Amino acid sequence: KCNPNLHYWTAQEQAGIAWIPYFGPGAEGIYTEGLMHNQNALVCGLRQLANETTQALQLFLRATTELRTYTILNRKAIDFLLRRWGGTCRILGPDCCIEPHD
Amino acid sequence: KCNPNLHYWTAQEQHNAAGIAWIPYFGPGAEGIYTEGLMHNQNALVCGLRQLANETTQALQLFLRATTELRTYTILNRKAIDFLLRRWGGTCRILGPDCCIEPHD
Amino acid sequence: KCNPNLHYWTAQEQHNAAGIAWIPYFGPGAEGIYTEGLMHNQNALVCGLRQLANETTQALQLFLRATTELRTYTILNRKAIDFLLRRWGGTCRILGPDCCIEPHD
Amino acid sequence: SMPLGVVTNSTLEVTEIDQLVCKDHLASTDQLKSVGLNLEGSGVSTDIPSATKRWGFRSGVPPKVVSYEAGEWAENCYNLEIKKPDGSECLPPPPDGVRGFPRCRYVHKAQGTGPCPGDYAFHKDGAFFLYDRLASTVIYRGVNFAEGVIAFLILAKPKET
Amino acid sequence: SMPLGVVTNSTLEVTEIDQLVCKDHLASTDQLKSVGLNLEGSGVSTDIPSATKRWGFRSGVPPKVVSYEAGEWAENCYNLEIKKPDGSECLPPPPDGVRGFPRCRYVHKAQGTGPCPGDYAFHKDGAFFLYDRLASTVIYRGVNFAEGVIAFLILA
Amino acid sequence: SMPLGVVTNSTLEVTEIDQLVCKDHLASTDQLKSVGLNLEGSGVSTDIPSATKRWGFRSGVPPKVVSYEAGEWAENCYNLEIKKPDGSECLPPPPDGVRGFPRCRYVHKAQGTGPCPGDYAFHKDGAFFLYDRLASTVIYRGVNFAEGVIAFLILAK
Amino acid sequence: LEKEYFDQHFFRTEQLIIRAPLTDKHIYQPYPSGADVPFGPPLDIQILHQVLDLQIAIENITASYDNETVTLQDICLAPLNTNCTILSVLNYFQNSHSVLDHKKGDDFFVYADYHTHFLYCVRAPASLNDTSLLHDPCLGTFGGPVFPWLVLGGYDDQNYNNATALVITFPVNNYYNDTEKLQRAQAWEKEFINFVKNYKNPNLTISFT
Amino acid sequence: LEKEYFDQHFGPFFRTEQLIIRAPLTDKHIYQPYPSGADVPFGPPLDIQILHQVLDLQIAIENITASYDNETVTLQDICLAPLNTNCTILSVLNYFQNSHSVLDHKKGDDFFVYADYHTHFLYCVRAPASLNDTSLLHDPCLGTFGGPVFPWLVLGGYDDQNYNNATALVITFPVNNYYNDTEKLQRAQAWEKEFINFVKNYKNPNLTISFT
Numbered sequence A: 001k002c003n004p005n006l007h008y009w010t011a012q013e014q015a016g017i018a019w020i021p022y023f024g025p026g027a028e029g030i031y032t033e034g035l036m037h038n039q040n041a042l043v044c045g046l047r048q049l050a051n052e053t054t055q056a057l058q059l060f061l062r063a064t065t066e067l068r069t070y071t072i073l074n075r076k077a078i079d080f081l082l083r084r085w086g087g088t089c090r091i092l093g094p095d096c097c098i099e100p101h102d
Numbered sequence B, C: 001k002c003n004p005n006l007h008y009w010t011a012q013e014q015h016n017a018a019g020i021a022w023i024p025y026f027g028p029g030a031e032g033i034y035t036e037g038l039m040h041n042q043n044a045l046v047c048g049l050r051q052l053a054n055e056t057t058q059a060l061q062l063f064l065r066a067t068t069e070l071r072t073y074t075i076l077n078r079k080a081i082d083f084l085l086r087r088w089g090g091t092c093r094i095l096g097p098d099c100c101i102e103p104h105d
Numbered sequence D: 001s002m003p004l005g006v007v008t009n010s011t012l013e014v015t016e017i018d019q020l021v022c023k024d025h026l027a028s029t030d031q032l033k034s035v036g037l038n039l040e041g042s043g044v045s046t047d048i049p050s051a052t053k054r055w056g057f058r059s060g061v062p063p064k065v066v067s068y069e070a071g072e073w074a075e076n077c078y079n080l081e082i083k084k085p086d087g088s089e090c091l092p093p094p095p096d097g098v099r100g101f102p103r104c105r106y107v108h109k110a111q112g113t114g115p116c117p118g119d120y121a122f123h124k125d126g127a128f129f130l131y132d133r134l135a136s137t138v139i140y141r142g143v144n145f146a147e148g149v150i151a152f153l154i155l156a157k158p159k160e161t
Numbered sequence E: 001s002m003p004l005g006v007v008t009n010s011t012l013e014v015t016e017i018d019q020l021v022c023k024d025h026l027a028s029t030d031q032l033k034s035v036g037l038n039l040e041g042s043g044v045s046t047d048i049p050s051a052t053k054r055w056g057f058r059s060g061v062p063p064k065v066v067s068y069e070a071g072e073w074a075e076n077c078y079n080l081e082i083k084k085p086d087g088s089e090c091l092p093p094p095p096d097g098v099r100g101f102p103r104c105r106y107v108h109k110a111q112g113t114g115p116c117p118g119d120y121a122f123h124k125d126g127a128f129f130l131y132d133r134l135a136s137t138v139i140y141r142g143v144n145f146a147e148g149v150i151a152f153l154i155l156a
Numbered sequence F: 001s002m003p004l005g006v007v008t009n010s011t012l013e014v015t016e017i018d019q020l021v022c023k024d025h026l027a028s029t030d031q032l033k034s035v036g037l038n039l040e041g042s043g044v045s046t047d048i049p050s051a052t053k054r055w056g057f058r059s060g061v062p063p064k065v066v067s068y069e070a071g072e073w074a075e076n077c078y079n080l081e082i083k084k085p086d087g088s089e090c091l092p093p094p095p096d097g098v099r100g101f102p103r104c105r106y107v108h109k110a111q112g113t114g115p116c117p118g119d120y121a122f123h124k125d126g127a128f129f130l131y132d133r134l135a136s137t138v139i140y141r142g143v144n145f146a147e148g149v150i151a152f153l154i155l156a157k
Numbered sequence G: 001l002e003k004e005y006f007d008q009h010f011f012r013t014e015q016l017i018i019r020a021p022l023t024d025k026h027i028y029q030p031y032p033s034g035a036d037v038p039f040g041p042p043l044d045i046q047i048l049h050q051v052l053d054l055q056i057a058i059e060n061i062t063a064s065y066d067n068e069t070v071t072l073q074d075i076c077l078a079p080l081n082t083n084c085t086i087l088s089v090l091n092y093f094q095n096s097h098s099v100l101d102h103k104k105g106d107d108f109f110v111y112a113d114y115h116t117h118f119l120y121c122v123r124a125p126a127s128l129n130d131t132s133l134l135h136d137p138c139l140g141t142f143g144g145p146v147f148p149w150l151v152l153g154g155y156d157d158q159n160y161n162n163a164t165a166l167v168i169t170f171p172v173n174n175y176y177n178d179t180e181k182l183q184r185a186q187a188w189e190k191e192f193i194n195f196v197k198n199y200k201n202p203n204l205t206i207s208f209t
Numbered sequence H: 001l002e003k004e005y006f007d008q009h010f011g012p013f014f015r016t017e018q019l020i021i022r023a024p025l026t027d028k029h030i031y032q033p034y035p036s037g038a039d040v041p042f043g044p045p046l047d048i049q050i051l052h053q054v055l056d057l058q059i060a061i062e063n064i065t066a067s068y069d070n071e072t073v074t075l076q077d078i079c080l081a082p083l084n085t086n087c088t089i090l091s092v093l094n095y096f097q098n099s100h101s102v103l104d105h106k107k108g109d110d111f112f113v114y115a116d117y118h119t120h121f122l123y124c125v126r127a128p129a130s131l132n133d134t135s136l137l138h139d140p141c142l143g144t145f146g147g148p149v150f151p152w153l154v155l156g157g158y159d160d161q162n163y164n165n166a167t168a169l170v171i172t173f174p175v176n177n178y179y180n181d182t183e184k185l186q187r188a189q190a191w192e193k194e195f196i197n198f199v200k201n202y203k204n205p206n207l208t209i210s211f212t
Helices: A043-063 A072-086 B046-053 B056-066 B075-089 C043-049 C056-066 C075-089 F048-054 G003-008 G045-059 G089-093 G114-123 G179-197 H002-008 H048-061 H092-096 H117-124 H182-200
Strands: A008-010 B008-010 C008-010 D004-007 D012-015 D032-038 D055-058 D070-072 D074-080 D104-110 D120-123 D128-131 D134-136 D146-155 E004-008 E011-015 E032-038 E055-058 E065-067 E070-072 E074-083 E104-113 E120-123 E128-130 E134-136 E146-155 F004-008 F011-015 F032-038 F055-058 F070-072 F079-083 F109-113 F120-123 F128-131 F134-136 F146-155 G012-019 G026-028 G037-039 G063-065 G068-070 G168-172 G205-208 H014-022 H029-031 H040-042 H066-068 H071-073 H171-176 H208-211
Touching: A043 D004, A043 D012, A043 D032, A043 D146, A072 B075, A072 C075, A072 D032, A072 D146, B046 B056, B046 E011, B046 E032, B046 E146, B056 E146, B075 C075, B075 E032, B075 E146, C043 F011, C056 F146, C075 F032, C075 F146, D032 D128, D074 D146, E032 E128, E074 E146, E134 E146, F032 F128, F048 F055, G012 G179, G037 G114, G045 G089, G045 G168, G045 G179, G063 G179, G068 G179, G089 G114, G168 G179, G179 G205, H014 H182, H040 H117, H048 H092, H048 H171, H048 H182, H066 H182, H071 H182, H092 H117, H171 H182, H182 H208
Parallel strands: D004 D146, D032 D070, D074 D104, E004 E146, E032 E070, E074 E104, F004 F146, F032 F070, F079 F109
Antiparallel strands: A008 D070, B008 E070, C008 F070, D004 D012, D032 D146, D055 D120, D128 D134, D128 D146, E004 E011, E032 E146, E055 E120, E065 E134, E128 E134, E128 E146, F004 F011, F032 F146, F055 F120, F128 F134, F128 F146, G012 G168, G012 G205, G026 G037, G063 G068, H014 H171, H014 H208, H029 H040, H066 H071
16 A cells, blocks of 8 residues: 655745744744655655665664764765775776766 | 954864873863964955855854754765765766866876 | 784674564664674784774874864764865876876877 | 665666766765655554554663654654553653654544553564654654654755655 | 855955865865854944843744854853743753853853743844854853854865 | 774784875775774783772863774773762763673672762873773763773775 | 930831731842842732832821811921931832832843842942942932831841831921920821721731830 | 670679760761672761760870879779780770771772771671771771770660661770778779769760760
């Protein structure tokens, strides 16, 4: 049983005398939402990824000592560059980027 | 109404030298760790730098609203990662219309 | 006087070879998560390993003095960012005098 | 090891962090996202006396929490207040900075007394409990939560999900 | 989106983390700096009952705090201990790891009683309250603070 | 500026991120490791009446703590509970998320009363106090600890 | 310390025992510095209003003698300014019911009020300025200082804020040398005693001596 | 056990001087052993802010002199000295060899107090006759007269064998009866008369002293 529709809230910002915390919205008026009707080749495939990510993530947490873990996305960014660029690259392009031009 | 004079305190150490002073049980307390300075005259920097603290106020307040943690130490670390991703996350070309590494014959 | 032997423990886990055991409610407690080993003979590495932890302690104490937070988990990440920043933050060259990459003609 | 999905032109590709290969550009950290999807969108049965059979108590595992950026519109949310037989709440109070689920359709409150073998209550299926942009492994008292799971994505130039 | 200043040979350039292309090389994390500049040095008038017109109380906004690396000599610091008309304290105890402003010229002490509509005291202009290498949006009790705002720099 | 060792084919090379040019590689963060090595292996006296001469009390320096990935098998561990002359404990409580040293061959438990000039207990030689994957400068009450120092390594794949 | 004053200056005196039966003593603190100061039971706004109504009514008490209406001002001691001498601690606020509710602070502080004026006046009864942000004089309505030990009681040492008694004294001319003025003074006294002894106010306990 | 002792050794060949001792001002404090032990509370008169006083009185009592004929009568002339000319002093203070410069000792470091008077008291109230407290200080609890000091004779107000909880530190001075020698009896009575007057008007508000 998969739900083709995904209604999501996202707490990211983007006004006059509104950024001030003393004037701005409270703790609940900070969310923006959207809608994903139909084209259920992405929503149901999205739900089939969080079920597989849980096994690795529950073991990633067991290793760490801290309570709150905000740095998973930054760690994947460093691993991105280190795999691409950490090793020596070649202009020939056997497995590395850098499109040759002459 | 700009103040052309800036006297700054800097809480960073000096790694090359020490001597039975890096030990916390021998070292300075919580107040004797600051290096100081002064920036008199040449007022094109300090007055142009007060005009930056007034501009990043809005962005910094809006960034903290979204974040859930209390203390934010990683603002500088993220901006370093964003530096490399713009340069090297995408593919450059030897000629480099939008990328660096100039060739030399 | 150095100890050539080094029996160590590591608190790391594997993703595979797990059935119903990845669940916290069914998995091992707070003590049955450590994998250990042994490093016999091989004294050129171990006694040279005990003579690096005697040298990094001063720099670690000074760094901890500089910071404000209690727990510091970020050191290795910062080192990785510094590595990338040296290698690629500055413009590289095809010859790579201080950079890398190999130009094929 | 941790699967990472790449969304391009409304199409998902399950891949790793190393098998990306080239030409799949990652330009900024903005297009890295973590989404928390609810278990109620996977065909479960959600009553208040029939959902108490997917969590149970345990001692010896420290609690762990993890943050996510985007969540879903919960059809059901729960709010439990359970105390030991004499006077002590089983559920630890929420840590400073953990609030209820932002958007809930119908909340399910449950007071009352019940036995509690174990320090903390974990999920019996391996899923998280979603709080306000923070997903945990345990249950905190007096705070709305929904049971869900997290996914990690790389988006294309569209960065809205 | 967040402005970034590039200090090259005692001259400042305002740019971002996207518009810069290169020839402004960043070599190490050391040269990324965060500095908190005082607001009293931008032409304001500060007494003890005349600076209270710049901040007030609100409920519903959770507090936040950031870190800044280098600071400035504060000409006037404040140290407040406020108690409710028939209550215990308005201002919260400082969170663990927060000290007073390292370098204050004169400190305006105050322990008073007054009304307090709202959980926390925020600034009415959007600036920060600076503490020892930590800047927050609220006022804590018994800790020396100065009003300022953070800038982010790359130094050559 | 911290020293950083490179392990290649089971030989150790001391270098710095400021040093090093191109021949060494870094493919993933997994091969960056932190190891905490004990001091008892350096042939030092180990008892309660004699180890006390290696650490003392101080006021004015706040506590700090860092994480380390891999440890050793502690020859000795210590468990201490000190109460001020009337009714109060000098040692601060273990901060949340800190446990005992996982693998000790022998411990040293003692609980008595003593004077305490100073807020916190510091090491009189510059070394750390090792706990469950968390190395601190101070001593906490009721928790097993071993005294050692940390190293930072890169492991070749 | 009390009978010394009544034998050096005074004149017949009307005095009342005053003690708070219902309320209790609360806390306060001076604004800039000065630790904590508790204020006695008769020193609360919830009850302080009543004692000033009693005194103002006493000042308005009239008695009939022959074809004349005898007021307090006809027989009271007015050293100057026709205002009668009122040895009462409310006289630090010039004896007005629209003044002892005053405020100066903001949504953060309360710089000065009856409290801070209280603490300064008991130390400098003759001052024309309390040195606070309100610059309210401490001198009484009759043009003279009000010594706190003559208008307070039940306090320990010089902690006059801890006083459980608020002494009010009305000096009245004895008129020993003038019989006719004595008759008018006695007529007002008879009305004053009856009004005070049957003052219906459960928040106050009023007797004589 | 009290009158049993005074009739087996202090039989009517010996007279005894005894005083009531109890702390009027202070109260009872708590002490804990060094290794693990169990926190044991001490009676009021066992606190050193006041315990120095109870020893000042006795060493003064040992120094009372009385005039008889042309002789100066001291306590040592009439006291029971079984050995060593030191008089028998039955008191808790005799566990520490009766000196004002000894009952402020320590053993420890700036971390733990390994041994002190505290642990020394617990040991010999169990082992009065032994020469070594088995602590790091190895201080004997045998008295200055060469004999053991039994806690139950020199303590009072305690529960069961918890001699620590005692609110009394009983002090007894055995004196020769001199029933067979009238001349020695006269000198003994002269010293006794000085002894009662001194102790009855001993001006210290920290102590309450009476007889029997």
